[PDB]
Symmetry: C3
Subunit: 210 residues, 3 copies
Amino acid sequence: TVDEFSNIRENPVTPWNPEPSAPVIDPTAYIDPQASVIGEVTIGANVMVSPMASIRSDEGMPIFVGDRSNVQDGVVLHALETINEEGEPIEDNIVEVDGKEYAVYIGNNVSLAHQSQVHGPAAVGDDTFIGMQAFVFKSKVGNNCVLEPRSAAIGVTIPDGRYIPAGMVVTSQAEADKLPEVTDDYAYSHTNEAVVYVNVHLAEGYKETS
Amino acid sequence: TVDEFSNIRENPVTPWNPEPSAPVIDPTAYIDPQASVIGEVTIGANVMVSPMASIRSDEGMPIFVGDRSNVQDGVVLHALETINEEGEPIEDNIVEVDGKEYAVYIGNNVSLAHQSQVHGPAAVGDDTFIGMQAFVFKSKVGNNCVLEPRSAAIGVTIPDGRYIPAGMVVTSQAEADKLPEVTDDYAYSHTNEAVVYVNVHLAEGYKETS
Amino acid sequence: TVDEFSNIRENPVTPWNPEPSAPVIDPTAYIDPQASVIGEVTIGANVMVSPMASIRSDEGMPIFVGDRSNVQDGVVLHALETINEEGEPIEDNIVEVDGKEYAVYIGNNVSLAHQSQVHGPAAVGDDTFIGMQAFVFKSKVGNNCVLEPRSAAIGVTIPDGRYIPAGMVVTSQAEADKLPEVTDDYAYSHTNEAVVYVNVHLAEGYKETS
Ligand SMILES: [Co+2]
Ligand SMILES: [Co+2]
Ligand SMILES: [Co+2]
């Protein structure tokens, strides 16, 4: 028979999750019916979650998405275990953003473009563009950054205001420290602000169809 | 309660889209129930759209998919804004194919393999294979081309009859002009014709299950 | 009207598939409602299939997933044609694992991480981690291997106990023979066993929600 389900659901009971949690989603955010949002997740105001995105906070938790951010088609957010079966927090898998602990922290005015992925432990600072098919894992991406399409940040801290060229896989802190800077003449210098404006308007337009 | 929705839908009203449009889909095309097709989209005859694909024509529009083409699992089609909020067409984000304007143009007998992405402005010429996990953005891919798995074309024109080796990210016109040619002994020389034959038969078989 | 469908379905009748087959899924496996599983597929015990995964055995068949393996969000399994329209088996597109023929063979205790893809003909040996956004096509990956995020294996045999560095695309047997070995001090040496433990527990937790 037809597959009947809820796409916004609590996470399952496991040895590291005694008490199930359901997503906390601002009334102004739009969650596409063909997106999936599971578990201990906070979604801020004016956020657009597109078809085929999967936000799954059932292993490492919590997963936060700030105000006016977007999670585009096929994007995945997931995280390594943050608390072991013996009730001990796995500090290496927990990110600290302003005195609060997260598995994945997506800041405000952040664009996660189509088919990208941010896997915890990870943090992405405000007004950053994570390009199409890009990857972030075990990293902290600063504010006002640009990850071009197919770039990746693994095990590093990307300083504020830097970009990663298309296709480059950054795996060492020495490499991350030498990334190029966003300047006004850089091709993606204005991309994130335009994308956030478009996506905040799409969230409202789609909300008016539900 | 269960998530109830239509997977083939009109696009939302926004400042660049006063009048919503619904997809125009040929009766011989097959759209999987777990694919999403939104907005100002034209889908040609005998096209197969597989599970988890997302064709979203709500920002840049229109998005065209020609006859006997295929949009495989997890493929995304989306596009940059083609008309600003002041009603002016953004010509840099509009592609011209035979005297008609598109955000994304996918030609006839084109295969978009699993997890690939074509982001407008972009055009993909007839009888071209866009490989698994490949990426096309701000580019024109000619006819009878092959993008091997994990290749990418960004900001360039790929001449007719050329291929991009697996994993290569092409970002300059000088690089695109020097791509290798498809010859009969090239490993993917016959791939697209076989894939189109298989996919046209799958579209019909799946249509017979609906 | 709302899109009503079954996400676990038989494959379509085609010239290479006279008699449709439906998936054989162990009662202990968990198939997310937003995953798709089509055709001649065998899923073993304690397997977790996550949101937006697509397992499609309608071209090359069969597709096997062994016990205690996981198919994470947005993963695709598909395969090249294994039998032509003249009823002849295409031996180059068929993989042999223990005296049985498969289009795609995923062994036991194998992790297919988010957005990865394994395209037949292909085999992945037991206790192997296929990282985030990785790709396997026309290859045999041995047991106890690690494909780091964004790595790829195309047209090769990856010897048992080896790893592929993040972002590396391996397309020649000479390259595959020289891959580095997994040792206890290697960063991903314990990853797969932890991931399988977590995923077997998630499968059970999610089963308790259905
Ligand atoms: Co994960
Ligand atoms: Co887009
Ligand atoms: Co395929």
